[PDB]
Specification:
This protein has a single domain, classed as 2-Layer Sandwich (Double Stranded RNA Binding Domain). It is of the alpha+beta class. It binds zinc ion (2 copies). One zinc ion (ZN) binds next to helix 2. This is Transcriptional repressor CTCF.
Length: about 90
C-alpha cells in the first residue's frame, strides 16, 4: 500500500520522545502540544461533543453551529477497542 495509503495501517515507533517525561509521539506537533499542555497548564485542548448526535468538535463555536444543522445520530455508533502491545 505504497504511494496510496499511509497512516491507516502502519505502526511506526514514535521517533519523538519527550525529554521531560517518558512519553512518545509520531508527529512533533503531538510532542509539541503535549509539553505546553501537561508540563504547562497554559495549552488547553478544545473538547466539545455534540448533544443531538454525539459527535466530536475541536471548536466551541464550530460545534454550536453544527448542532443547528445537526439532525441527529441517525444510527448506533461509538464503540471500538484495540487491546494490543505494539
Ligand atoms: Zn513530556
Ligand atoms: Zn450533532
Amino acid at each position: 500500500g505504497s504511494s496510496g495509503s499511509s497512516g491507516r495501517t502502519h505502526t511506526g515507533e514514535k521517533p519523538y520522545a519527550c525529554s521531560h517525561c517518558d512519553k512518545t509521539f509520531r508527529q512533533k506537533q503531538l510532542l509539541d502540544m503535549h509539553f505546553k499542555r501537561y508540563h504547562d497548564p497554559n495549552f488547553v485542548p478544545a473538547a466539545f461533543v455534540c448533544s443531538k448526535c454525539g459527535k466530536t468538535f475541536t471548536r466551541r463555536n464550530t460545534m454550536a453551529r453544527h448542532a443547528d444543522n445537526c439532525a441527529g445520530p441517525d444510527g448506533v455508533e461509538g464503540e471500538n477497542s484495540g487491546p494490543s502491545s505494539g
